[PDB]
Design an enzyme around this catalytic site. Structure first.
Site, PDB file in Angstrom:
ATOM      1  N   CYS A 199       0.792  -1.239   0.000  1.00  0.00           N
ATOM      2  CA  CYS A 199       0.000   0.000   0.000  1.00  0.00           C
ATOM      3  C   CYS A 199       0.810   1.267   0.000  1.00  0.00           C
ATOM      4  O   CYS A 199       1.295   1.714   1.033  1.00  0.00           O
ATOM      5  CB  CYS A 199      -0.938   0.056   1.200  1.00  0.00           C
ATOM      6  SG  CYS A 199      -1.958   1.577   1.312  1.00  0.00           S
TER       7      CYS A 199
ATOM      8  N   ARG B  11       0.921   4.773   2.694  1.00  0.00           N
ATOM      9  CA  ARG B  11       1.267   4.741   4.128  1.00  0.00           C
ATOM     10  C   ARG B  11       1.856   5.994   4.743  1.00  0.00           C
ATOM     11  O   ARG B  11       1.921   6.099   5.964  1.00  0.00           O
ATOM     12  CB  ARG B  11       2.117   3.517   4.495  1.00  0.00           C
ATOM     13  CG  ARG B  11       1.371   2.247   4.316  1.00  0.00           C
ATOM     14  CD  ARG B  11       2.274   1.035   4.521  1.00  0.00           C
ATOM     15  NE  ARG B  11       3.094   0.709   3.352  1.00  0.00           N
ATOM     16  CZ  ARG B  11       3.810  -0.398   3.257  1.00  0.00           C
ATOM     17  NH1 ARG B  11       3.772  -1.267   4.254  1.00  0.00           N
ATOM     18  NH2 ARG B  11       4.537  -0.647   2.188  1.00  0.00           N
TER      19      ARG B  11
ATOM     20  N   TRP C 186      -8.472   7.505   0.188  1.00  0.00           N
ATOM     21  CA  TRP C 186      -8.843   8.094  -1.101  1.00  0.00           C
ATOM     22  C   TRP C 186      -8.083   7.406  -2.219  1.00  0.00           C
ATOM     23  O   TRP C 186      -7.081   6.743  -1.966  1.00  0.00           O
ATOM     24  CB  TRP C 186      -8.599   9.615  -1.135  1.00  0.00           C
ATOM     25  CG  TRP C 186      -7.231  10.071  -0.689  1.00  0.00           C
ATOM     26  CD1 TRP C 186      -6.093  10.141  -1.451  1.00  0.00           C
ATOM     27  CD2 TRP C 186      -6.865  10.546   0.619  1.00  0.00           C
ATOM     28  NE1 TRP C 186      -5.044  10.631  -0.695  1.00  0.00           N
ATOM     29  CE2 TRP C 186      -5.495  10.886   0.575  1.00  0.00           C
ATOM     30  CE3 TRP C 186      -7.562  10.721   1.819  1.00  0.00           C
ATOM     31  CZ2 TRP C 186      -4.819  11.388   1.688  1.00  0.00           C
ATOM     32  CZ3 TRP C 186      -6.879  11.222   2.927  1.00  0.00           C
ATOM     33  CH2 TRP C 186      -5.532  11.542   2.855  1.00  0.00           C
TER      34      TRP C 186
ATOM     35  N   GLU D 184      -5.562   3.918 -10.099  1.00  0.00           N
ATOM     36  CA  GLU D 184      -6.493   2.810  -9.869  1.00  0.00           C
ATOM     37  C   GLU D 184      -7.737   2.964 -10.712  1.00  0.00           C
ATOM     38  O   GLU D 184      -8.308   1.949 -11.140  1.00  0.00           O
ATOM     39  CB  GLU D 184      -6.979   2.699  -8.437  1.00  0.00           C
ATOM     40  CG  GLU D 184      -6.097   1.972  -7.502  1.00  0.00           C
ATOM     41  CD  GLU D 184      -6.161   2.625  -6.140  1.00  0.00           C
ATOM     42  OE1 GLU D 184      -6.083   1.912  -5.130  1.00  0.00           O
ATOM     43  OE2 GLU D 184      -6.314   3.866  -6.074  1.00  0.00           O
TER      44      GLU D 184
HETATM   45  C1  HEM Z   1      -4.852   7.486   2.274  1.00  0.00           C
HETATM   46  C2  HEM Z   1      -4.950   7.156   0.974  1.00  0.00           C
HETATM   47  C3  HEM Z   1      -4.581   5.756   0.395  1.00  0.00           C
HETATM   48  C4  HEM Z   1      -4.019   5.539  -0.783  1.00  0.00           C
HETATM   49  C5  HEM Z   1      -3.610   6.609  -1.795  1.00  0.00           C
HETATM   50  C6  HEM Z   1      -3.879   4.123  -0.962  1.00  0.00           C
HETATM   51  C7  HEM Z   1      -3.352   3.510  -2.061  1.00  0.00           C
HETATM   52  C8  HEM Z   1      -3.246   2.159  -2.255  1.00  0.00           C
HETATM   53  C9  HEM Z   1      -2.970   1.518  -3.520  1.00  0.00           C
HETATM   54  C10 HEM Z   1      -2.804   2.287  -4.849  1.00  0.00           C
HETATM   55  C11 HEM Z   1      -2.910   0.191  -3.309  1.00  0.00           C
HETATM   56  C12 HEM Z   1      -2.655  -0.898  -4.375  1.00  0.00           C
HETATM   57  C13 HEM Z   1      -3.969  -1.630  -4.651  1.00  0.00           C
HETATM   58  C14 HEM Z   1      -4.274  -1.944  -6.113  1.00  0.00           C
HETATM   59  O1  HEM Z   1      -4.123  -1.049  -7.003  1.00  0.00           O
HETATM   60  O2  HEM Z   1      -4.707  -3.106  -6.401  1.00  0.00           O
HETATM   61  C15 HEM Z   1      -3.133  -0.030  -1.896  1.00  0.00           C
HETATM   62  C16 HEM Z   1      -3.137  -1.235  -1.268  1.00  0.00           C
HETATM   63  C17 HEM Z   1      -3.551  -1.453   0.015  1.00  0.00           C
HETATM   64  N1  HEM Z   1      -3.821  -0.474   0.957  1.00  0.00           N
HETATM   65 FE1  HEM Z   1      -4.031   1.597   0.559  1.00  0.00          FE
HETATM   66  N2  HEM Z   1      -4.344   3.488   0.156  1.00  0.00           N
HETATM   67  C18 HEM Z   1      -4.803   4.459   1.000  1.00  0.00           C
HETATM   68  C19 HEM Z   1      -5.367   4.231   2.219  1.00  0.00           C
HETATM   69  C20 HEM Z   1      -5.386   3.040   2.866  1.00  0.00           C
HETATM   70  C21 HEM Z   1      -6.026   2.753   4.134  1.00  0.00           C
HETATM   71  C22 HEM Z   1      -6.840   3.713   5.022  1.00  0.00           C
HETATM   72  C23 HEM Z   1      -5.792   1.472   4.392  1.00  0.00           C
HETATM   73  C24 HEM Z   1      -6.245   0.654   5.629  1.00  0.00           C
HETATM   74  C25 HEM Z   1      -6.076   1.118   6.876  1.00  0.00           C
HETATM   75  C26 HEM Z   1      -5.006   0.933   3.314  1.00  0.00           C
HETATM   76  C27 HEM Z   1      -4.579  -0.353   3.277  1.00  0.00           C
HETATM   77  C28 HEM Z   1      -4.232  -1.041   2.156  1.00  0.00           C
HETATM   78  C29 HEM Z   1      -4.206  -2.480   2.051  1.00  0.00           C
HETATM   79  C30 HEM Z   1      -4.569  -3.500   3.158  1.00  0.00           C
HETATM   80  C31 HEM Z   1      -3.758  -2.744   0.608  1.00  0.00           C
HETATM   81  C32 HEM Z   1      -3.538  -4.095  -0.093  1.00  0.00           C
HETATM   82  C33 HEM Z   1      -4.479  -5.174   0.458  1.00  0.00           C
HETATM   83  C34 HEM Z   1      -4.883  -6.137  -0.636  1.00  0.00           C
HETATM   84  O3  HEM Z   1      -4.000  -6.901  -1.153  1.00  0.00           O
HETATM   85  O4  HEM Z   1      -6.102  -6.119  -0.974  1.00  0.00           O
HETATM   86  N3  HEM Z   1      -4.757   1.924   2.399  1.00  0.00           N
HETATM   87  N4  HEM Z   1      -3.332   1.188  -1.278  1.00  0.00           N
HETATM   88  C1  LIG Z   2      -7.852   1.401   1.212  1.00  0.00           C
HETATM   89  C2  LIG Z   2      -7.635   1.406  -0.262  1.00  0.00           C
HETATM   90  C3  LIG Z   2      -7.189   2.571  -0.865  1.00  0.00           C
HETATM   91  C4  LIG Z   2      -7.001   2.556  -2.240  1.00  0.00           C
HETATM   92  N1  LIG Z   2      -6.570   3.677  -2.857  1.00  0.00           N
HETATM   93  N2  LIG Z   2      -7.243   1.431  -2.976  1.00  0.00           N
HETATM   94  C5  LIG Z   2      -7.668   0.267  -2.419  1.00  0.00           C
HETATM   95  C6  LIG Z   2      -7.927  -0.954  -3.324  1.00  0.00           C
HETATM   96  C7  LIG Z   2      -7.172  -2.285  -3.008  1.00  0.00           C
HETATM   97  C8  LIG Z   2      -7.853  -3.562  -3.509  1.00  0.00           C
HETATM   98  C9  LIG Z   2      -9.102  -3.890  -2.986  1.00  0.00           C
HETATM   99  C10 LIG Z   2      -9.796  -5.031  -3.388  1.00  0.00           C
HETATM  100  N3  LIG Z   2     -11.019  -5.309  -2.847  1.00  0.00           N
HETATM  101  C11 LIG Z   2      -9.210  -5.874  -4.346  1.00  0.00           C
HETATM  102  C12 LIG Z   2      -7.945  -5.588  -4.882  1.00  0.00           C
HETATM  103  C13 LIG Z   2      -7.360  -6.530  -5.938  1.00  0.00           C
HETATM  104  C14 LIG Z   2      -6.776  -7.866  -5.450  1.00  0.00           C
HETATM  105  C15 LIG Z   2      -7.810  -8.952  -5.183  1.00  0.00           C
HETATM  106  C16 LIG Z   2      -8.235  -9.870  -6.173  1.00  0.00           C
HETATM  107  C17 LIG Z   2      -9.200 -10.852  -5.840  1.00  0.00           C
HETATM  108  C18 LIG Z   2      -9.709 -11.863  -6.841  1.00  0.00           C
HETATM  109  C19 LIG Z   2      -9.710 -10.900  -4.532  1.00  0.00           C
HETATM  110  C20 LIG Z   2      -9.261  -9.975  -3.572  1.00  0.00           C
HETATM  111  N4  LIG Z   2      -9.752 -10.001  -2.300  1.00  0.00           N
HETATM  112  N5  LIG Z   2      -8.326  -9.038  -3.921  1.00  0.00           N
HETATM  113  C21 LIG Z   2      -7.272  -4.417  -4.464  1.00  0.00           C
HETATM  114  C22 LIG Z   2      -7.877   0.257  -1.026  1.00  0.00           C
END
Ligand code: HEM
Ligand SMILES: Cc1cc(N)nc(CCc2cc(N)cc(CCc3cc(C)cc(N)n3)c2)c1
Ligand code: HEM
Ligand SMILES: Cc1cc(N)nc(CCc2cc(N)cc(CCc3cc(C)cc(N)n3)c2)c1
Ligand SMILES: C[C@H](O)[C@H](O)[C@H]1CNc2nc(N)[nH]c(=O)c2N1
Ligand SMILES: C[C@H](O)[C@H](O)[C@H]1CNc2nc(N)[nH]c(=O)c2N1
Ligand SMILES: [Zn+2]
Lengths: 404, 403
Positions: free
Chosen positions: A108, A111, A280, A285
């Protein structure tokens, strides 16, 4: 040299040594024979200790390490775990450790902001209705007119063989996805299966590309209930392009809040299952992943015909040209509704600042390079050149099974 | 135990058993994954790398067991036992080389691996003789623009005693001349190597694009300076198909990417100088060379003529620009009739090469981060396609600079 991993930054040529990973009490997916970095999906004894672990982290963030306040909480949990087989988190800990988790998710870029997160406790929650207003509360707070705010609401933990608390949908905000008698999908095909579960769980559907999905929710043991969101609650953004006049006409749109929901928050051994969070968006994305992946909306081709581009041929770079413009219209449209966004350079540059903070403080920052480097213009962002070390620190977030 | 590998654009799901062949460690462990790191940190074993390799050969031509094999496996034992080492019959080297390209997990052009041409330089005993092999190799591989995949293999590595080394990293390279102002005319990642050519006696230009001479080192020789016949080298002048003003930038680039510094390891043996060239995939030119900050860094420049708000990141100038740099790289080579490939065409074909190995060797290693192009990454199928990385043999290592 040092025996911990060495970490060069090929732009700035600077080295760091990651001493943090020395604490990853949790194994990954790599042997020394091979690397599975790319790969997306990968009872007293061990609880007592996982708990002990988090407490120690806690008292350290309030600098009281080894002190009696400390050995007293440690025995407040030993008591608790021993005679009942769980324990509960003093609110303030849950807050620290809900942060620790954001700070710990190596995928992410967001952070820098880790320490700026509103934790709402929703651990008193006792029903599928209560559930819902909690969420609406969350959404109102964190959408905040357009000046978006990092937030997380936490509903009760796993219990020994008692129903789990699940939000069935993956996001608090998805668009519907409607399977045709063709084989095409009307809407966002990301979430068809769920659009399905929606209808045949009570929902009268729509006919549109962007039909705002209503919420499948589920309290312990109880059957999953279906609640719809107030429309004036759900802030979306029409899309337009500063220069290309015709973009506004494609009738495209996304929605302010990115609220992950389908994920398990794990702190000191306890399990959160329904603890949805939202920040946000970063402009890539929306404009690369959601709008341009062919296994999604996949406009692209569309936009590039109105672009007047030669698509017959691969090497005219219409695929790329077009996508740039998409993002830009994602960006400009947001900038212009006075809604909170952040382009991939802007984000990366600050994630880099973040890495440096973590360095001084904790001694590294776990990162899943493939995910940190944005889906376009990789090499143009600073992170692209930072070597990264990935590892699993706890408290963390886990991917979890769908409830069906 | 055996890695499941799902693609996410098509839901393809596959299993890599070719990893179980890997014999040498990576930097990753269970604790912490370092996949993204650029580079790493008795004689009876040589013997077992030999068999293992030699097997790969006879086994490759479908003969593994019958005479020749059995016979030639004993030349080896006979040779190793009483020289501490052995030598490769030539058609075997041509197998080794072909294989080590097929193997190297960072290479996106591997589909081509069958179509390689192998020059045997094992007989080289001086930097004079080397210069030829090089001049000759470049003349073959440039082929007036119809570029052809080709390695040349200088003497192996005698136990105690020097190495044959090319000191250049590539063959054709651009001189980078440091100014006092910590300013740098030309290609910044060649700053060092230029002054070596200098200190070892060369006369510099002071144009931005000046093909560096060649430092060739035979064993325990102070390396010698040799100059590339001006036209053995082919350059492309860069223009943009619709942006008239571009080419008034004067920017240009050479047709041959040729590695001069990697250790071809074949079945035990180490060839410390074995240059190889194929062809450019454009993003290397436009995206690394022309825009990398640590380099020729013309991103800003291009944008400003393109007439775009540098002021802010949110105008996306850097990417807008980048695509046009890249578009100029593609046009110009197709115009100068000079084989080049776009990240798309390439990654597309790489995908296919993945499905080939899958039904062939039963797997294949790729380095996701390196196999995915630098710009517009997710707009290529390699992006959505989970890969495994592991170290097979024969293959290319890196090696310490000969200073
Ligand atoms: C403040 C603005 C934030 C931005 C700009 C941001 C941005 C991102 C981006 C671009 C990704 C990659 C996901 C993708 O494109 O598939 C990501 C992943 C992730 N972020 Fe953020 N995020 C934000 C806030 C947060 C918050 C509030 C949380 C939780 C407390 C968070 C937790 C996570 C987690 C757990 C993942 C990856 C989890 C997964 O594999 O599904 N982020 N973030
Ligand atoms: C907090 C926050 C901020 C921000 N800017 N963007 C996000 C999106 C992250 C994300 C969220 C989901 N639900 C799935 C994926 C793909 C990966 C994936 C694929 C499949 C098939 C299942 C699964 N659970 N996740 C990525 C979150
Ligand atoms: C024929 C057309 C070829 C194409 C289009 C191609 C493409 C590429 C690209 C783009 C890279 C990554 C470098 C970077 O991203 O900066 C690469 C890596 C590599 N390729 Fe190729 N390649 C080709 C031929 C060859 C040949 C003929 C060989 C040797 C027989 C080869 C061996 C390698 C090796 C050893 C690496 C990575 C090692 C390193 O870190 O430098 N490639 N390939
Ligand atoms: C130790 C070390 C030193 C040093 N100076 N640079 C590196 C980085 C890796 C790298 C090095 C070189 N010389 C060439 C490429 C492109 C290689 C390439 C070759 C071919 C044949 C085609 C293609 N498209 N790309 C990559 C490592
Ligand atoms: C196959 C690939 O590893 C996988 O799709 C990852 C790569 N990088 C990513 N990066 C981001 N930001 N989001 C993603 O969903 C992915 N997907
Ligand atoms: C840190 C990272 O592993 C390193 O910069 C890699 C990543 N991806 C790359 N991609 C390309 N095309 N070329 C490279 O040199 C690299 N370098
Ligand atoms: Zn790994």
């Amino acid at each position: 040299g040092p025996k911990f991993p060495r970490v060069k930054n090929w732009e700035l040529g600077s080295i760091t040594y990651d001493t943090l990973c020395a604490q990853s009490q949790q194994d990954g997916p790599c042997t020394p024979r091979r690397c599975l970095g790319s790969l997306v999906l990968p009872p007293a004894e061990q609880l007592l200790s996982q708990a002990r672990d988090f407490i120690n982290q806690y008292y350290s963030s309030i600098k009281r390490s080894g002190s009696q306040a400390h050995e007293e909480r440690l025995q407040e949990v030993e008591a608790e775990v021993a005679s009942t087989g769980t324990y509960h988190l003093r609110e303030s800990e849950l807050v620290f450790g809900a942060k620790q988790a954001w700070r710990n998710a190596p995928r992410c870029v967001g952070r820098i902001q880790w320490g700026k997160l509103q934790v709402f406790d929703a651990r008193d929650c006792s029903s599928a209705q209560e559930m819902f207003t909690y969420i609406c509360n969350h959404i109102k707070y964190a959408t905040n007119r357009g000046n978006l705010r990092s937030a997380i609401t936490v509903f009760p933990q796993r219990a020994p063989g008692r129903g789990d608390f699940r939000i069935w949908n993956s996001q608090l905000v998805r668009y519907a996805g409607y399977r045709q008698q063709d084989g095409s999908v009307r809407g966002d095909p990301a979430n068809v299966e769920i659009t399905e579960l929606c209808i045949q769980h009570g929902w009268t559907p729509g006919n549109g590309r962007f039909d705002v999905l209503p919420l499948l929710l589920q309290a312990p043991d109880e059957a999953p209930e279906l609640f719809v969101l107030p429309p004036e609650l759900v802030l979306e953004v029409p899309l337009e392009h500063p220069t290309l006049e015709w973009f506004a006409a494609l009738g495209l749109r996304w929605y302010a809040l990115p609220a992950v929901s389908n994920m398990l928050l794990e702190i000191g051994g306890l399990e959160f299952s329904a603890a949805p969070f939202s920040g946000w968006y970063m402009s890539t994305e929306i404009g690369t992943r959601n709008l341009c992946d062919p296994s999604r909306y996949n406009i692209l081709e569309d936009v590039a015909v109105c672009m007047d581009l030669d698509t017959r041929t691969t090497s005219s770079l219409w695929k790329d040209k077009a996508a740039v413009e998409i993002n830009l219209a994602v960006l400009h449209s947001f900038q212009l509704a006075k809604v909170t966004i952040v382009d991939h350079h802007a984000a990366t540059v600050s994630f880099m600042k973040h890495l440096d903070n973590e360095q001084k403080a904790r001694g590294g920052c776990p990162a899943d390079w493939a995910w940190i480097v944005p889906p376009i213009s990789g090499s143009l962002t600073p992170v692209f050149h930072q070597e990264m070390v990935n590892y699993i620190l706890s408290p963390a977030f886990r991917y979890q099974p769908d409830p069906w």
